[PDB]
Symmetry: C2
Subunit: 78 residues, 2 copies
């Protein structure tokens, strides 16, 4: 039953992850980091060329989305 709750969370986080593709964060960075010394090329190289970065980026988006899935189910129970 806790194990049925984790299922709901994982399914929900599956859907959320789809609505949060990586280009949203790249856009964010281009828009907010240029004034801080980071050029389009560097942000672009991170997002399009850097394998390790892409993966660690996917890991965290999954964590973000698992965490809010968790809270969504909390409010579903209240």
């Amino acid at each position: 039953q806790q194990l049925a709750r984790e299922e709901k969370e994982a399914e929900l986080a599956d859907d959320m992850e789809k609505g949060i593709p990586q280009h949203l964060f790249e856009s964010l960075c281009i828009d907010h980091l240029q004034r801080h010394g980071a050029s389009k090329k560097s942000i672009t190289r991170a997002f399009d060329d850097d394998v390790e970065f892409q993966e660690r980026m996917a890991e965290h988006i999954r964590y973000m989305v698992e965490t809010i899935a968790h809270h969504q189910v909390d409010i579903d129970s209240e």
Copy 2:
């Protein structure tokens, strides 16, 4: 000590860039994109504002992003 000075520059660049990326910019990204994908506004905000572990791990990834971009930027500064 040439490579240390490079890393120290990378690190200070990251310090600067980090100020451009407060957490609420990410909260807004999520409320703008996740509502069609199963999340309510409340759930996102609960994560961003009430969940202390989320905040810390959020801060740390942001710091990771900025160090990695800083690294790429100094590489480009040396080509």
